[PDB]
Amino acid sequence: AQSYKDLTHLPAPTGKIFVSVYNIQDETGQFKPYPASNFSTAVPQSATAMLVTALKDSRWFIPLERQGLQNLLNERKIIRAAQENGTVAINNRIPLQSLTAANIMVEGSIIGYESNVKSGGVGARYFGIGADTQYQLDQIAVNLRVVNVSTGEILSSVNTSKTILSYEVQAGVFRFIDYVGYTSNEPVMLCLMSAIETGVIFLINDGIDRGLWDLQNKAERQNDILVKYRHMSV
Amino acid sequence: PRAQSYKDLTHLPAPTGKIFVSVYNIQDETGQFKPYPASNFSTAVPQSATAMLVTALKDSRWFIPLERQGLQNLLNERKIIRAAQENGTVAINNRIPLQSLTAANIMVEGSIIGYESNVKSGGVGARYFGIGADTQYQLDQIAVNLRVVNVSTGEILSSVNTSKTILSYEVQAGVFRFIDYVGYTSNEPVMLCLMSAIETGVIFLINDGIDRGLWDLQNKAERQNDILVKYRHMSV
Amino acid sequence: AQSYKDLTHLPAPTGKIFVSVYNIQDETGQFKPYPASNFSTAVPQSATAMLVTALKDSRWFIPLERQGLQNLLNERKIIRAAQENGTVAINNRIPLQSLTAANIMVEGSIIGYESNVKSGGVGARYFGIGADTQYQLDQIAVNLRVVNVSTGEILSSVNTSKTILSYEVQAGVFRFIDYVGYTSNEPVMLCLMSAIETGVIFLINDGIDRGLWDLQNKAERQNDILVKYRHMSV
Amino acid sequence: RAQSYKDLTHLPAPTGKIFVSVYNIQDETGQFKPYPASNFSTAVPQSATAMLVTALKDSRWFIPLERQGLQNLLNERKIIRAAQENGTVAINNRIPLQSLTAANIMVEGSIIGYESNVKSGGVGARYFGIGADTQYQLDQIAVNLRVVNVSTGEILSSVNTSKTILSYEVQAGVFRFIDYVGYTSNEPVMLCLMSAIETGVIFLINDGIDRGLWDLQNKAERQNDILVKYRHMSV
Amino acid sequence: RAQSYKDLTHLPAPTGKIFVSVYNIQDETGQFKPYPASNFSTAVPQSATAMLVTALKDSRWFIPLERQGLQNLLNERKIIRAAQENGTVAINNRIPLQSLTAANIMVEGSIIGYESNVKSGGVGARYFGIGADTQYQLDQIAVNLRVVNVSTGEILSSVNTSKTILSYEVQAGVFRFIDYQRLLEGEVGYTSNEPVMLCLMSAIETGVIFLINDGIDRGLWDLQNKAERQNDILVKYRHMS
Amino acid sequence: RAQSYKDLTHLPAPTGKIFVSVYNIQDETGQFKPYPASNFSTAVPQSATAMLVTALKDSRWFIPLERQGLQNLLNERKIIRAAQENGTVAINNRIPLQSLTAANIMVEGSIIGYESNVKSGGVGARYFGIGADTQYQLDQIAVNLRVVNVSTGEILSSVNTSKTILSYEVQAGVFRFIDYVGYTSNEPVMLCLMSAIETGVIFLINDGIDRGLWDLQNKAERQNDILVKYRHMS
Amino acid sequence: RAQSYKDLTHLPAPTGKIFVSVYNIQDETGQFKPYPASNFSTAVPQSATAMLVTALKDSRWFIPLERQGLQNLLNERKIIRAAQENGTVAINNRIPLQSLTAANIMVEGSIIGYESNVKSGGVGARYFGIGADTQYQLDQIAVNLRVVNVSTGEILSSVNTSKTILSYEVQAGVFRFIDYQVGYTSNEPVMLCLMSAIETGVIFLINDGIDRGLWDLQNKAERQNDILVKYRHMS
Amino acid sequence: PRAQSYKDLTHLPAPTGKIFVSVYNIQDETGQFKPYPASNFSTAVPQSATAMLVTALKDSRWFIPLERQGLQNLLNERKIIRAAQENGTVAINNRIPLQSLTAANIMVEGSIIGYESNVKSGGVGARYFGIGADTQYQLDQIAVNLRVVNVSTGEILSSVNTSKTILSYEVQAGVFRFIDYVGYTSNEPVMLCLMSAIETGVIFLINDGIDRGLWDLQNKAERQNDILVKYRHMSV
């Protein structure tokens, strides 16, 4: 997808930013219609994992684990129990630091989702397909927030929407366009990822502008990708 | 392009100074879900009013929202910070100075108190949309209540109510025509509805606060600002 | 609507009354029938929000927030922590009083709800529509109680029933009859709201008669609205 | 208003009114409404407790103490005390606290059974006066009320009432009914629940007379028309 | 009123009424009503404990002690103590507290089975004297009552009852019924109560009589007149076991 | 009464009855009834535990100690002690407390399987001697009973029983049945559960005898008619 | 009884029986039965843990220690201690308490997958010997058994078994079956599947343990036993 | 036969020494269940990913997995042991020497992040499977995410994502022909998909770790290994 390429070729910052990752909540309230199970969610429930990946892939952030904090704490208990008596095989000693802290924490909401099946119309032209074949429209809105831990104020809050027309051309292969491409992943997931990745870039952009963080070369503020995504926020 | 509610909200007259306000949840108190063939669990209304409100309070240029949903998370992070620096070994460039959590005298809270949606044909919609009297458009109505509570006393200072009614139909794949009891939107209508209501509520809120002396304008004359009188009139 | 106009034009009391607002529980047990979701409630779940609005709008009461008492308390902790060390910017100082108390607390129940689709009969006659055209009947019963915090005894206990025949004439506009007028609100919404509004007035009347609270002008005990709602209460 | 209400509100007086604590009346019918109702729609309103509290008051025999929101009460009292302990509160805003009113008996109960069927013609049709094609409704609710001695925990009384109501709609939202003749604007099942609880309160008062828990002001009134009406009902 | 009630209300007297703690009778049938009922509609009423208490009282053998609402009781007693500890309460309003009454036995139970099917013709049609195409109902309930020794935790008594009732509606809200345990005797009764409830109640009332008999036979409690062990009702119910 | 019941109530006597604590028999079939039953109707009764207690009592080999309501018991004993500590209790109402009777063996169990199929013609039709289009049902239950040594926690015995019952209704509420012909007034699936549990208790008794967990009064009677009958069944 | 049970009950003996604490076997298939079953009817019986315990005993290799109901155990022991601490209990009623027996190993597991579909013809029709239009049933279950070292928390052994059973009914409640690599059973097929799988897992476990020196055979020569080598090859 | 992923996983080059890793759950975060006529409660994907991961980590010969799911059970058993020998009376042949629970510097965790399943006919399936264009095969797609966390600092060291797509159809009862974007399988296709994704996940993880200097190979000659290069190309 284009978002992944843009995300992976940003200009570099002075240094990577520590950030603690809390959840991206699904707040659409939406599930699939008949004949799905009543319990089948309309959107994957994996936004947080995607965010962690998107933050790392940006080359701008060091994500700190918080979802499984209790597990972390246990493991550290077990380490301490294994070395407090000074008998542990030295090749097996694990030096413990204090957990890395962060001044900002990142959180989010999937704020909306719409999906409908369509045929012909504008989609059929851009795809180069028959005016009777049925395609899909998937739209997701994501909100990402960065909170200041020192004060509890919101440092940054971007909103992204991605809308994707798609249709199956081969078993398990989809052609799609971002309001032209090939994808092997489900359209709805491509949408969720693309929205989250874009959100991270929006995030990085907003932070540069507000002096939360700066680029290695301030000259690189006018990088093609950065202005591309800066303009997607009007 | 973007709704009238957003435009009005983002061009309000300024307050003497921005007001800190703590935001807790906006509950969906409609009791409503989508009918067959929806999943029984599909909510009629989006479940993200709180995020929308935080964004709208910020966008008004009147408020600095303090997020409280993850207060418990915030507090843990501060524990983790203190534990990392109490021994004075942390790399000086990685030191995180802690202030006190910013406090607020007022707390804003709310409810989505009503929602109705039905599909319609002909009538006023058909005329204003300029469509066939057999062609179907949709009506979405959402009602929101916003309350301001005094943290020092616990008195409920303000309690405003807004209703937004939106007529819509899809004209192109993923594009909707709408009327606010004509515009175009790329967003699903029930969300356009909820957003407009929340944004309107924040404006109603600001007005009520001025009138009750909860907060004051920078320019005392601008009590007769076009936007403020517009929304003042929607409340009578 | 009539209830609202009347509620906002009550004669004034000697002084506004503090009251703690606790929930109005939905005790109908009722949800919407096919094709609604099984989980769709028959009645909105916002009676309490409406009570607070009605109490303030009566200009008789000062409602004290209790649903978010725990949040309140937290904010007060945060306030104290921010100023106990005396370093806070003097203009950023927030003086804390004790939470305002109340001798009475108001609570309630939605004790019954009926909703049915109908044709012909009285509706058709008064609405002036075909005996084949369909209207809705919505009926709600509400109970409001005022409790003495000092003794735990019930100070006042009023009951209201609102019955509304309605039908849609235009997209989103209903003509209704109160067992003719026009409303933009959903009928069940208007029914619940009207019952609660009427309830507060019933409450206020009962309170006057039982000496729980007094009017500035005792002569206005014969106010048009007050006697109107006194007549309904029998 | 129904006969039950009339009777309840015209009982002979007791020596002095009785404090009684009311905790919830549980729906123990296990019953919900059939298709096309939501699976979650209860057959019977979930508001019996509120109704009982009202009925206890209306009888003029009892002063009901509500306990459902006891924890809220307690909080309010915390807030009151915190507000005046430092003696700075304006004397006009001072709230004098008494001790919460206590009671020796606790009343509790269950809705123990419910049946509803749609009927056509038959016997009802005659007292209603219509053809074997019009459909009327039968609603039957059974309630149990218990009185508990708080001092000892003995269950002093356990009465049972059944109300059966035949009804059918004549006008939109207006019902004709017969109590195994009147008109009601209230939904029949709710008229039934209410009539059951009201009747129960009277069964309770009678049973208390008979067990020496309380007696009448005027001993002659021990064989009052209403009290005797409902005693015969209870056997 | 059912025969079970008549019999329960005319048992011979004991030396003294027996204190008993009443805990719940659990519905362990696992059964709900079929389409078109709500999935949540229970096949059997959920009110056996309320009925048990009434049956224990109506027997004139027991004094039931409240335990379902034990926590509420305790609260009320707190409130009481708080109201008179400062010695200012109006003397007419003073409430003397004893210790909660104890009991050496607790009674508990299970509804262990429930069967219901609609039938036509057959033996029912004969004994009811109705058309072989008219529909009647069969309801069967099984109840288990246990008496537990609180001093030792041993189970003192565990009786089992089944009541089977054929019924059909004859008038609006009036049912004619038969008690399969007397089917061939051809006696038919009328009831205003729903059949599954008459069934539940009749089983529970029978269980208590079974219970009183077992206790008599095992010396858990005694009759005033030892001679009255040969009372008609006691041998009637002694034989059903 | 069932063959199982006759056999259980006429076993050879043990040297003396055995105290055993009874904890639950869990329904571990995972099975509920099909359409048009309620989704919530269990396939099998939920009263196996009460049945076991009755069966253990009825064997004349065990004295079951009630543990399901252990917490209630303990409460009752608090209440007794509170009523007598002050030495004021009415002498005829005095309750002497012993210690709760203890037991060295715990009995517990699982219903591990259930099958129900309604059938037509075939072998059933022959043994019943009915029309070959008339429909009968097959019910099969598998039960597991375990005895645990409380001193050590070792599992002393683990027996498994399967009962399969063919039945069809011949009179209203009366069933003819066969255990791979008899009459029962009880529902076939209950007869199935009960019979399995009764057989289980006998199995248990045999295994205990064989392993020296407990002994019979006359050691020669190991060759009792009933004991060998059920011994051969496994 | 099936090939798995005969085999489990005729294994070569170990040096001595092994204590193992049994915690649950979780159903991790996520699977329930389709229409017209109740939505809540599980595809697979929920009794794997009871079955494992039975299998472990039946192997004559293990002594299972009950842990599912450990708190009940603990309560009963409290009651015993309470009954004899005051030295008055009748000596014949005295219960000597040891410490709960411990174990160096802990056995745990998961049912990790399940399939069921109905079929016609193919290998089944041949091994069953019926026409290619007559229908048989396929049930397949995958189980994972783990043995964990309590001293270190490392996983000591981890076997995986899949059993596939083709089946169809010939008489009411009697089935023809095949252990897809012919037999009779009175039990439901998915039952025989789970049980055969759990029994196979225990043998796989015993084998893996011998090979890794977790436990030893009486006679190391018996390493080439017919049953043991049979199960070595299926792994 | 057995999937290529398994074959590749079990023939990796050895690391300098095997690495202890603690494994907590792999959550199903697809939100997906089976459609009618399945039970509403039937999950689309097996709920046994964690067992499968533990199995995969062992099989790679790079890791020693420490299961933590029953940590509480473990701890209880150790209590029981200690209580059983603290009085020094236990039978010597039954004596159990307790070490400390083995610790690990890294902790592995993961999510099933996506799942789609469809029944299909004709197209590529009919061609490669060699079946009638009306004959039905199924498509299963699963996406897995594995994360490695530093237990000493809480930094998330690695987060790899894998997708497996499998076309399949049953050819004989309980035997499937399948294609991994022809082979035969006795196991169910959705399980084959989940297993293959997880195995691939582990190799991706090993690769990422080499790259980030978390670990290196025993034999320097093996730095450019065919299997390691194969699976790097699937990521890029």
Side-chain angles (χ1 to χ4, degrees), chain E residues 21 23 28-35 39-40 67 99-104 106 108 110 112-115 117 119 123 138 140 144 146 150-155 158 160 180 183, chain F residues 19 33 35-36 38-42 45-47 50 53-54 57 64-66 72-73 76-77 79-80 82-83 95-101 169 171-173 175 185-187 190:
Chain E
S21 318
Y23 286 89
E28 294 172 353
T29 68
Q31 296 314 285
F32 298 73
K33 292 189 183 184
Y35 192 85
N39 278 263
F40 297 102
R67 296 305 189 245
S99 271
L100 288 184
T101 301
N104 181 42
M106 56 185 195
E108 61 185 15
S110 320
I112 58 179
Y114 173 76
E115 187 192 354
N117 52 56
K119 247 69 179 174
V123 288
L138 171 72
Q140 185 185 324
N144 170 233
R146 303 178 290 283
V150 176
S151 179
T152 64
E154 298 177 3
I155 300 188
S158 190
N160 289 280
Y180 243 90
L183 172 72
Chain F
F19 290 117
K33 294 189 184 185
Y35 192 87
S38 159
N39 277 263
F40 296 109
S41 286
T42 64
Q46 300 296 287
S47 48
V53 166
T54 303
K57 276 187 79 69
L65 307 177
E66 185 272 342
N72 291 334
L73 241 190
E76 291 305 315
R77 303 172 105 247
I79 291 174
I80 288 175
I95 303 167
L97 280 184
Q98 302 294 308
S99 270
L100 283 179
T101 297
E169 209 174 23
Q171 203 179 288
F175 303 81
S185 56
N186 274 119
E187 189 180 355
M190 209 175 180

Side-chain angles (χ1 to χ4, degrees), chain F residues 37 100 170 179 192:
Chain F
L100 283 179
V170 47
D179 183 343
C192 200

Side-chain angles (χ1 to χ4, degrees), chain C residues 85-163:
Chain C
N85 289 323
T87 62
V88 62
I90 297 104
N91 209 352
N92 293 349
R93 212 151 71 107
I94 302 168
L96 280 184
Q97 301 174 9
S98 271
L99 288 182
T100 302
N103 178 39
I104 51 161
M105 71 183 82
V106 65
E107 62 185 15
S109 320
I110 307 168
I111 64 182
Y113 175 80
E114 185 193 354
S115 180
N116 294 314
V117 159
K118 287 193 161 51
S119 65
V122 154
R125 186 182 178 233
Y126 290 100
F127 279 139
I129 55 175
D132 65 338
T133 300
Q134 277 187 336
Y135 55 107
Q136 195 70 40
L137 174 147
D138 297 285
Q139 186 180 6
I140 216 178
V142 186
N143 167 229
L144 299 190
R145 305 178 291 280
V146 178
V147 185
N148 191 342
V149 171
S150 177
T151 64
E153 304 183 11
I154 299 188
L155 273 181
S156 180
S157 188
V158 301
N159 284 277
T160 65
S161 280
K162 227 85 235 233
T163 302

